[PDB]
Amino acid sequence: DTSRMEEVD
Amino acid sequence: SPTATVAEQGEDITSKKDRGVLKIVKRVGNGEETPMIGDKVYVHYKGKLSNGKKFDSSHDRNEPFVFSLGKGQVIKAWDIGVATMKKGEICHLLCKPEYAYGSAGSLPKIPSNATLFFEIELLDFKGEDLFEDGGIIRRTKRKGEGYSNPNEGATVEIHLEGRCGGRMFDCRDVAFTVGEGEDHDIPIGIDKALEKMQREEQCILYLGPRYGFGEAGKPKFGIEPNAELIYEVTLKSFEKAKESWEMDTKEKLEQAAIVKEKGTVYFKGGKYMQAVIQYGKIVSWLEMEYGLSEKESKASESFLLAAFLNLAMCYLKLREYTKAVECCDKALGLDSANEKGLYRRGEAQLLMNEFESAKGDFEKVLEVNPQNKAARLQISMCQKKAKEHNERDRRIYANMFKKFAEQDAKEEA
Numbered sequence: 001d002t003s004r005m006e007e008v009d
Numbered sequence: 010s011p012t013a014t015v016a017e018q019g020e021d022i023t024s025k026k027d028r029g030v031l032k033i034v035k036r037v038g039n040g041e042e043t044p045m046i047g048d049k050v051y052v053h054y055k056g057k058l059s060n061g062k063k064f065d066s067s068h069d070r071n072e073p074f075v076f077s078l079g080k081g082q083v084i085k086a087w088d089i090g091v092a093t094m095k096k097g098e099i100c101h102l103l104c105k106p107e108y109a110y111g112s113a114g115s116l117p118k119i120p121s122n123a124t125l126f127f128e129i130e131l132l133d134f135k136g137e138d139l140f141e142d143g144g145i146i147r148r149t150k151r152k153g154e155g156y157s158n159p160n161e162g163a164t165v166e167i168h169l170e171g172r173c174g175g176r177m178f179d180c181r182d183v184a185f186t187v188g189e190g191e192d193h194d195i196p197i198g199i200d201k202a203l204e205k206m207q208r209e210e211q212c213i214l215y216l217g218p219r220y221g222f223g224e225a226g227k228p229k230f231g232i233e234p235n236a237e238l239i240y241e242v243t244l245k246s247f248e249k250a251k252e253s254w255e256m257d258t259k260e261k262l263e264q265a266a267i268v269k270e271k272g273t274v275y276f277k278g279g280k281y282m283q284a285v286i287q288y289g290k291i292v293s294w295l296e297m298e299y300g301l302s303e304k305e306s307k308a309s310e311s312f313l314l315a316a317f318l319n320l321a322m323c324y325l326k327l328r329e330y331t332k333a334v335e336c337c338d339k340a341l342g343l344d345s346a347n348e349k350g351l352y353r354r355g356e357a358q359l360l361m362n363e364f365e366s367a368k369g370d371f372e373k374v375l376e377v378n379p380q381n382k383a384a385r386l387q388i389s390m391c392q393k394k395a396k397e398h399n400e401r402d403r404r405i406y407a408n409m410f411k412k413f414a415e416q417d418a419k420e421e422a
Contacts, residue, residue: 002383005352008273008322009315 012061012126015103022093029105030086035128038095044134045213046079046149050091053130061126064118073132079149084109087129094131102127136215145202146215153207153244161188161286162250165203169195170241171230178230182245188286191275194229196221197282199242206244214240253294258305261294265312272319285323291316292339314343321353325360333357348377355387364395 019031044050051073055066067074076082078091086104094100106112106122114121139145159165164186171179185193190200198220206212218235226234256264272287295309317340324333337354340347355370368391374384 002381005349005356005383006322007349008276008319009349 011101012057012103015101015126019103022089023108024089027105027107029108030089031103032090032093033101034098035101036097036099036130038098038131040096042096043094044078044092044131045136046152047137048078048134048148049075049137050078050134051075051132052091053132055128057126057128058120059124059126077137078134084125086125087127090127091129091131094129096131096133098131100129102129136213139202139205142217142219144217144220145198146217147202147205148213148215149210150213150241151209151211151243153210155207155210155244157249158206159187159203159244159247160250160252161200161204162290163187163203163247165247166245167199167203168241168243168245169199172239173230173232173236176231178227178232187247187250189283191280191283194227196227196238198238199240202242203244203247206242208244208246211241211243214242216240256294258298258301258309261298262305262308262312265291265295265309269312269315269319272316276319276323281323281327285320285327288316288320288323292320296339310343314340314347317343318347318349318353321350321357325353325357330357330360334361346377348374348381351377352381352384355384355391359387359391359394362394362398364391364398367391 015031015033019028019033021028021030022032023029052075053067053073055068056064058064063069079088081088083091084104086102086108089108090100090102104125104127106124109123109125110119112122114123119125136146136148139147164184166182166184168182169179170177179194183193183195185195187200187203190197196216198214198216201220202212202214216238218237221236221238222230222232222234224234226232226236232238251260268287268290272284275281275284275287291312295313298309301309317336321333321336321340324330324336334354334357337350337357340350341354344350351370351374355367355374358364358367358370368388371384371387371391374381375388378384
């Protein structure tokens with residue numbers, strides 16, 4: 001679930 | 010004696026038709042391809058004056074002379090000449106002073122108003138390799154009137170003809186932004202080549218696997234993955250993008266949001282090459298700026314850190330891990346504690362097999378967010394993959410020790 005590190009800003 | 014032959018029976022290959030350049034083919038060449046403007050022409054020649062005196066020769070070196078044809082790098086007569094030749098051809102050229110060195114000559118070797126004789130052997134000829142990788146080979150049909158080339162972001166008006174194994178899949182007048190060809194089903198190669206093109210230029214471009222539609226192909230054009238494409242581009246007109254310093258902060262901040270959103274669209278679509286272009290505009294416009302308002306500076310810094318973190322993401326997905334670390338370094342410059350910047354740095358470093366370097370990055374991630382489960386898994390991954398790298402390195406060394414001992418021992422008889 002630590003897929004934040006794949007999320008763009 | 011071979012000078013009187015061309016003087017008697019010679020093909021007047023001049024545009025003006027004034028007997029200035031006369032040709033006679035001594036030895037024919039294979040293929041019906043003739044060299045075009047800007048091509049790298051490899052030739053062998055012998056030069057003899059009006060009486061027959063051998064002034065300068067390449068055969069008295071046996072090493073060929075390479076020059077760009079129709080670029081004014083040789084006498085008028087040669088640029089007209091070699092253009093009519095086939096590969097492997099030997100022809101005798103008779104050149105009037107008007108098409109040679111004029112009344113001026115090239116003293117002490119060439120006299121004033123001298124009718125020169127040549128024996129030119131077209132050894133080989135290649136088109137212009139735009140990025141010296143073989144990815145884009147340009148052949149020019151028409152020279153541009155241009156003084157400036159379009160830039161990444163320029164809106165261009167072009168005519169485009171596209172062939173895949175001789176089959177035409179595209180033939181249209183299209184208007185688009187350089188860097189944003191995908192939007193109009195144009196391969197990245199065209200955008201890249203347009204920056205080296207002039208207004209009113211007509212050229213053929215051979216788009217190699219890297220500058221075409223790539224691994225996915227273009228199903229609507231029935232183009233298979235990494236297919237080689239030949240395009241015919243005519244730069245009808247263009248309007249250049251504003252340079253970084255040509256825009257005020259107000260414009261730069263308005264444009265930052267548009268191109269950031271456009272970049273994110275490309276990213277989500279999996280068009281990472283085009284995502285890198287859009288975010289790279291933010292970096293180009295805002296990285297070196299100073300003397301901004303409190304509100305302007307805080308905003309500029311937000312877009313700048315976003316662009317760097319997004320570019321890291323792009324470069325990771327593009328398998329370009331060095332650029333990814335470069336962007337993480339820039340981002341971590343601005344925000345030394347950024348979770349994503351630190352994590353993505355560890356990702357690209359683990360991929361470049363810099364295990365201990367990456368260990369630290371994922372460790373510094375836990376220092377920030379200790380509830381990040383993924384950094385812990387990647388620390389144990391760094392450990393496991395580093396142990397594998399040493400065993401493998403130990404094996405290769407032990408086997409190359411065997412090779413340079415079982416083969417080197419036979420060095421007796």
